[PDB]
mmCIF file of C-alpha atoms in Angstrom:
data_model
loop_
_atom_site.group_PDB
_atom_site.id
_atom_site.type_symbol
_atom_site.label_atom_id
_atom_site.label_comp_id
_atom_site.label_asym_id
_atom_site.label_seq_id
_atom_site.Cartn_x
_atom_site.Cartn_y
_atom_site.Cartn_z
ATOM 1 C CA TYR A 256 83.250 62.573 32.729
ATOM 2 C CA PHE A 257 80.739 62.450 35.582
ATOM 3 C CA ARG A 258 83.271 61.556 38.252
ATOM 4 C CA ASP A 259 85.599 64.288 36.979
ATOM 5 C CA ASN A 260 82.791 66.879 37.149
ATOM 6 C CA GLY A 261 81.931 66.383 40.808
ATOM 7 C CA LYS A 262 79.014 64.056 40.070
ATOM 8 C CA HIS A 263 78.618 60.375 40.898
ATOM 9 C CA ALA A 264 78.315 57.598 38.338
ATOM 10 C CA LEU A 265 77.720 53.854 38.314
ATOM 11 C CA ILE A 266 78.889 51.672 35.425
ATOM 12 C CA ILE A 267 77.980 48.029 34.861
ATOM 13 C CA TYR A 268 80.037 46.018 32.378
ATOM 14 C CA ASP A 269 77.957 43.041 31.326
ATOM 15 C CA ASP A 270 79.848 40.860 30.700
ATOM 16 C CA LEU A 271 83.602 41.292 30.837
ATOM 17 C CA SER A 272 84.012 37.624 29.902
ATOM 18 C CA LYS A 273 82.791 38.614 26.417
ATOM 19 C CA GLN A 274 85.079 41.610 26.096
ATOM 20 C CA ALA A 275 87.861 39.120 26.773
ATOM 21 C CA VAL A 276 86.624 36.924 23.913
ATOM 22 C CA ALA A 277 86.367 39.864 21.515
ATOM 23 C CA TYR A 278 89.886 40.946 22.446
ATOM 24 C CA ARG A 279 91.133 37.408 21.866
ATOM 25 C CA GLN A 280 89.557 37.344 18.414
ATOM 26 C CA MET A 281 91.130 40.696 17.543
ATOM 27 C CA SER A 282 94.547 39.619 18.784
ATOM 28 C CA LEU A 283 94.421 36.298 16.957
ATOM 29 C CA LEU A 284 93.421 37.970 13.691
ATOM 30 C CA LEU A 285 96.271 40.479 14.008
ATOM 31 C CA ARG A 286 98.515 37.370 14.230
ATOM 32 C CA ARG A 287 99.767 38.196 17.728
ATOM 33 C CA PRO A 288 100.891 34.945 19.402
ATOM 34 C CA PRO A 289 98.266 33.357 21.663
ATOM 35 C CA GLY A 290 98.660 32.642 25.355
ATOM 36 C CA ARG A 291 96.852 30.446 27.869
ATOM 37 C CA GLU A 292 93.454 29.230 26.651
ATOM 38 C CA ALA A 293 94.376 31.199 23.493
ATOM 39 C CA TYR A 294 93.843 34.538 25.239
ATOM 40 C CA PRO A 295 96.582 37.080 24.492
ATOM 41 C CA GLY A 296 99.211 37.779 27.101
ATOM 42 C CA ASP A 297 97.754 41.234 27.774
ATOM 43 C CA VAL A 298 94.399 39.912 28.985
ATOM 44 C CA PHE A 299 94.880 40.884 32.628
ATOM 45 C CA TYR A 300 96.024 44.351 31.583
ATOM 46 C CA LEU A 301 92.918 44.655 29.396
ATOM 47 C CA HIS A 302 90.758 44.546 32.514
ATOM 48 C CA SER A 303 93.064 46.022 35.139
ATOM 49 C CA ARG A 304 93.479 49.250 33.187
ATOM 50 C CA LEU A 305 89.684 49.360 32.805
ATOM 51 C CA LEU A 306 88.564 48.681 36.373
ATOM 52 C CA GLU A 307 91.246 50.962 37.816
ATOM 53 C CA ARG A 308 89.338 53.976 36.480
ATOM 54 C CA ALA A 309 86.543 53.469 39.036
ATOM 55 C CA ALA A 310 87.935 55.867 41.622
ATOM 56 C CA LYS A 311 86.563 58.040 44.429
ATOM 57 C CA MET A 312 87.984 61.509 43.925
ATOM 58 C CA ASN A 313 88.824 63.588 46.968
ATOM 59 C CA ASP A 314 87.140 66.918 47.600
ATOM 60 C CA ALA A 315 89.965 68.806 45.877
ATOM 61 C CA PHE A 316 89.220 67.011 42.581
ATOM 62 C CA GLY A 317 85.472 67.620 42.707
ATOM 63 C CA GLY A 318 84.600 64.796 45.057
ATOM 64 C CA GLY A 319 82.954 62.797 42.294
ATOM 65 C CA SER A 320 83.023 59.021 42.156
ATOM 66 C CA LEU A 321 82.540 56.179 39.683
ATOM 67 C CA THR A 322 81.403 52.800 40.988
ATOM 68 C CA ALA A 323 81.873 49.730 38.805
ATOM 69 C CA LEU A 324 79.981 46.422 38.828
ATOM 70 C CA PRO A 325 81.673 44.108 36.325
ATOM 71 C CA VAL A 326 79.757 40.920 35.565
ATOM 72 C CA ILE A 327 81.694 37.710 34.957
ATOM 73 C CA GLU A 328 80.280 34.357 33.879
ATOM 74 C CA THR A 329 81.875 31.153 35.132
ATOM 75 C CA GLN A 330 81.517 27.679 33.623
ATOM 76 C CA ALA A 331 79.752 25.250 35.965
ATOM 77 C CA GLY A 332 80.919 27.290 38.944
ATOM 78 C CA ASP A 333 84.601 26.924 38.002
ATOM 79 C CA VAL A 334 85.630 30.186 39.625
ATOM 80 C CA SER A 335 89.190 28.886 39.215
ATOM 81 C CA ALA A 336 89.160 29.660 35.482
ATOM 82 C CA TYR A 337 91.464 32.215 33.876
ATOM 83 C CA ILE A 338 89.413 35.390 33.370
ATOM 84 C CA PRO A 339 87.388 34.841 36.574
ATOM 85 C CA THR A 340 90.577 34.666 38.635
ATOM 86 C CA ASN A 341 92.079 37.697 36.907
ATOM 87 C CA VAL A 342 89.028 39.829 37.584
ATOM 88 C CA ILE A 343 88.653 38.495 41.131
ATOM 89 C CA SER A 344 92.211 39.590 41.866
ATOM 90 C CA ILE A 345 91.478 42.962 40.235
ATOM 91 C CA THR A 346 88.228 43.925 41.974
ATOM 92 C CA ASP A 347 87.527 44.891 45.582
ATOM 93 C CA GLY A 348 84.520 42.791 46.516
ATOM 94 C CA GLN A 349 82.613 39.904 45.018
ATOM 95 C CA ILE A 350 79.044 38.652 44.897
ATOM 96 C CA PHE A 351 78.904 34.909 44.296
ATOM 97 C CA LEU A 352 75.658 33.687 42.758
ATOM 98 C CA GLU A 353 75.190 29.914 42.828
ATOM 99 C CA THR A 354 72.739 27.749 40.915
ATOM 100 C CA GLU A 355 72.375 25.361 43.850
ATOM 101 C CA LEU A 356 71.050 28.336 45.815
ATOM 102 C CA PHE A 357 68.984 29.613 42.895
ATOM 103 C CA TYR A 358 67.062 26.343 42.662
ATOM 104 C CA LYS A 359 66.907 25.758 46.419
ATOM 105 C CA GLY A 360 64.655 28.828 46.536
ATOM 106 C CA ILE A 361 67.203 31.433 47.652
ATOM 107 C CA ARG A 362 66.815 34.336 45.223
ATOM 108 C CA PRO A 363 68.944 36.411 44.779
ATOM 109 C CA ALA A 364 71.326 33.480 44.980
ATOM 110 C CA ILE A 365 73.992 35.590 46.678
ATOM 111 C CA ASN A 366 76.291 33.167 48.499
ATOM 112 C CA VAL A 367 76.740 35.234 51.639
ATOM 113 C CA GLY A 368 79.347 32.766 52.873
ATOM 114 C CA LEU A 369 81.840 33.616 50.125
ATOM 115 C CA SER A 370 80.697 37.085 49.065
ATOM 116 C CA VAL A 371 83.123 39.726 50.321
ATOM 117 C CA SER A 372 83.518 43.497 50.387
ATOM 118 C CA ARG A 373 86.785 45.065 51.514
ATOM 119 C CA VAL A 374 85.146 48.356 52.490
ATOM 120 C CA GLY A 375 82.743 46.499 54.766
ATOM 121 C CA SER A 376 82.203 48.681 57.825
ATOM 122 C CA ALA A 377 82.737 51.936 55.941
ATOM 123 C CA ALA A 378 80.142 52.784 53.282
ATOM 124 C CA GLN A 379 77.242 51.533 55.394
ATOM 125 C CA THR A 380 74.526 53.557 57.083
ATOM 126 C CA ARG A 381 74.586 53.530 60.865
ATOM 127 C CA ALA A 382 71.230 51.760 61.219
ATOM 128 C CA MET A 383 72.222 49.068 58.735
ATOM 129 C CA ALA B 1 84.541 19.005 36.716
ATOM 130 C CA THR B 2 88.157 20.140 36.498
ATOM 131 C CA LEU B 3 91.148 17.981 37.397
ATOM 132 C CA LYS B 4 91.468 19.308 40.948
ATOM 133 C CA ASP B 5 87.777 18.742 41.678
ATOM 134 C CA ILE B 6 88.078 15.143 40.503
ATOM 135 C CA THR B 7 91.289 14.601 42.461
ATOM 136 C CA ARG B 8 89.788 15.875 45.710
ATOM 137 C CA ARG B 9 86.624 13.828 45.230
ATOM 138 C CA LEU B 10 88.635 10.688 44.475
ATOM 139 C CA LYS B 11 90.792 11.126 47.571
ATOM 140 C CA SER B 12 87.726 11.657 49.756
ATOM 141 C CA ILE B 13 85.998 8.534 48.457
ATOM 142 C CA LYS B 14 89.168 6.495 48.969
ATOM 143 C CA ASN B 15 89.310 7.602 52.604
ATOM 144 C CA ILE B 16 85.629 6.748 53.033
ATOM 145 C CA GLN B 17 86.182 3.264 51.622
ATOM 146 C CA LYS B 18 89.125 2.653 53.950
ATOM 147 C CA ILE B 19 87.046 3.705 56.948
ATOM 148 C CA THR B 20 84.084 1.526 55.996
ATOM 149 C CA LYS B 21 86.338 -1.511 55.542
ATOM 150 C CA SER B 22 87.822 -0.985 58.993
ATOM 151 C CA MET B 23 84.359 -0.616 60.501
ATOM 152 C CA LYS B 24 83.173 -3.804 58.807
ATOM 153 C CA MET B 25 86.071 -5.674 60.399
ATOM 154 C CA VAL B 26 85.321 -4.211 63.837
ATOM 155 C CA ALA B 27 81.621 -5.017 63.516
ATOM 156 C CA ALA B 28 82.422 -8.579 62.467
ATOM 157 C CA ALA B 29 84.584 -9.125 65.545
ATOM 158 C CA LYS B 30 81.907 -7.678 67.820
ATOM 159 C CA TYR B 31 79.337 -9.879 66.079
ATOM 160 C CA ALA B 32 81.338 -13.031 66.719
ATOM 161 C CA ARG B 33 81.580 -12.118 70.387
ATOM 162 C CA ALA B 34 77.868 -11.264 70.521
ATOM 163 C CA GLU B 35 76.820 -14.627 69.077
ATOM 164 C CA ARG B 36 79.102 -16.428 71.510
ATOM 165 C CA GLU B 37 77.468 -14.584 74.406
ATOM 166 C CA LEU B 38 73.990 -14.982 72.903
ATOM 167 C CA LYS B 39 73.801 -18.746 73.002
ATOM 168 C CA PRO B 40 73.623 -19.104 76.821
ATOM 169 C CA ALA B 41 71.406 -16.044 77.109
ATOM 170 C CA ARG B 42 69.168 -17.649 74.491
ATOM 171 C CA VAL B 43 68.638 -20.732 76.646
ATOM 172 C CA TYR B 44 68.226 -18.592 79.771
ATOM 173 C CA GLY B 45 65.598 -16.295 78.266
ATOM 174 C CA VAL B 46 63.683 -19.136 76.638
ATOM 175 C CA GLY B 47 63.537 -20.850 80.011
ATOM 176 C CA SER B 48 62.308 -17.658 81.646
ATOM 177 C CA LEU B 49 59.509 -17.495 79.076
ATOM 178 C CA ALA B 50 58.693 -21.193 79.586
ATOM 179 C CA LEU B 51 55.982 -20.605 82.188
ATOM 180 C CA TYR B 52 53.676 -18.330 80.221
ATOM 181 C CA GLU B 53 53.599 -20.502 77.102
ATOM 182 C CA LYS B 54 53.156 -23.597 79.280
ATOM 183 C CA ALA B 55 50.357 -22.101 81.406
ATOM 184 C CA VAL C 8 97.052 8.538 42.613
ATOM 185 C CA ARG C 9 96.841 8.222 46.405
ATOM 186 C CA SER C 10 94.728 9.445 49.307
ATOM 187 C CA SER C 11 95.789 11.517 52.300
ATOM 188 C CA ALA C 12 94.516 12.311 55.766
ATOM 189 C CA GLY C 13 91.919 15.026 56.160
ATOM 190 C CA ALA C 14 90.699 14.684 52.578
ATOM 191 C CA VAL C 15 86.976 14.273 53.255
ATOM 192 C CA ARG C 16 86.829 17.874 54.467
ATOM 193 C CA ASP C 17 89.157 19.058 51.690
ATOM 194 C CA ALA C 18 86.746 18.043 48.935
ATOM 195 C CA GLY C 19 83.930 19.920 50.642
ATOM 196 C CA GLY C 20 81.252 17.728 49.104
ATOM 197 C CA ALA C 21 78.281 16.468 51.091
ATOM 198 C CA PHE C 22 80.373 14.378 53.479
ATOM 199 C CA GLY C 23 82.515 17.402 54.306
ATOM 200 C CA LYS C 24 79.585 19.544 55.410
ATOM 201 C CA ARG C 25 77.968 16.580 57.152
ATOM 202 C CA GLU C 26 81.140 15.977 59.161
ATOM 203 C CA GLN C 27 81.552 19.667 59.964
ATOM 204 C CA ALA C 28 78.019 19.803 61.349
ATOM 205 C CA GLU C 29 78.360 16.510 63.238
ATOM 206 C CA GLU C 30 81.377 18.064 64.946
ATOM 207 C CA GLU C 31 79.915 21.507 65.578
ATOM 208 C CA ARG C 32 76.671 20.302 67.156
ATOM 209 C CA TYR C 33 78.509 17.989 69.547
ATOM 210 C CA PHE C 34 80.983 20.627 70.630
ATOM 211 C CA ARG C 35 78.288 23.274 71.058
ATOM 212 C CA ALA C 36 76.549 20.840 73.407
ATOM 213 C CA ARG C 37 79.742 20.186 75.362
ATOM 214 C CA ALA C 38 80.521 23.910 75.497
ATOM 215 C CA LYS C 39 77.070 24.531 76.960
ATOM 216 C CA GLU C 40 77.637 21.858 79.606
ATOM 217 C CA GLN C 41 81.079 23.225 80.474
ATOM 218 C CA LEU C 42 79.735 26.774 80.711
ATOM 219 C CA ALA C 43 77.033 25.598 83.110
ATOM 220 C CA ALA C 44 79.683 23.900 85.242
ATOM 221 C CA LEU C 45 81.827 27.045 85.115
ATOM 222 C CA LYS C 46 78.917 29.164 86.341
ATOM 223 C CA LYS C 47 78.246 26.695 89.150
ATOM 224 C CA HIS C 48 81.896 26.773 90.217
ATOM 225 C CA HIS C 49 81.900 30.577 90.071
ATOM 226 C CA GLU C 50 78.901 30.778 92.388
ATOM 227 C CA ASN C 51 80.221 28.088 94.737
ATOM 228 C CA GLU C 52 83.625 29.792 95.066
ATOM 229 C CA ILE C 53 82.479 33.354 95.861
ATOM 230 C CA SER C 54 82.675 32.721 99.611
#
């Protein structure tokens, strides 16, 4: 609504790894056949159709925007898991938080080595 | 960890073990040579110290 | 299960980072030396 009415919005799904679990429970109780790790087949779609709504409308469509900051939770840093990889291949950037950095005193634990942002140069003030 | 983590760690440790075995062999050869060359130098140096402990 | 060349830096454990640093420090030093020599040659070859 906000992005369609020329305003700017920010949405923070927290977590998406629990929406995936709720969807899996629904799908298993409707008797739909399971998939990998028991998640339904349509588990990528579930998220891709959801994170694709965070657009940046041009000035003809109001100019409004909707940023999204999905939060995923990995297991012992296994970024290679199923839902983490799906959402990593869906989103633009990433912000890797690591426990080894959290306890080494670096807080926020952002792992600047791996954290990425496709926009990069653009969307940054000239001084910064 | 997962299977790939364990596989990579196992391969790395196997390489490390190979390298340390090779280095032990090299060090043993160099040690044998060093002992062989140390005997005469042992007598030579002990002689050179002779004076101070005698006077 | 076997082992292959260049596996210590594929795991990326402690030995991988240790080796990467042991390489980078040495080659930074040699690059500094070579740059000094390059500057000296530049100056000595102007004439």
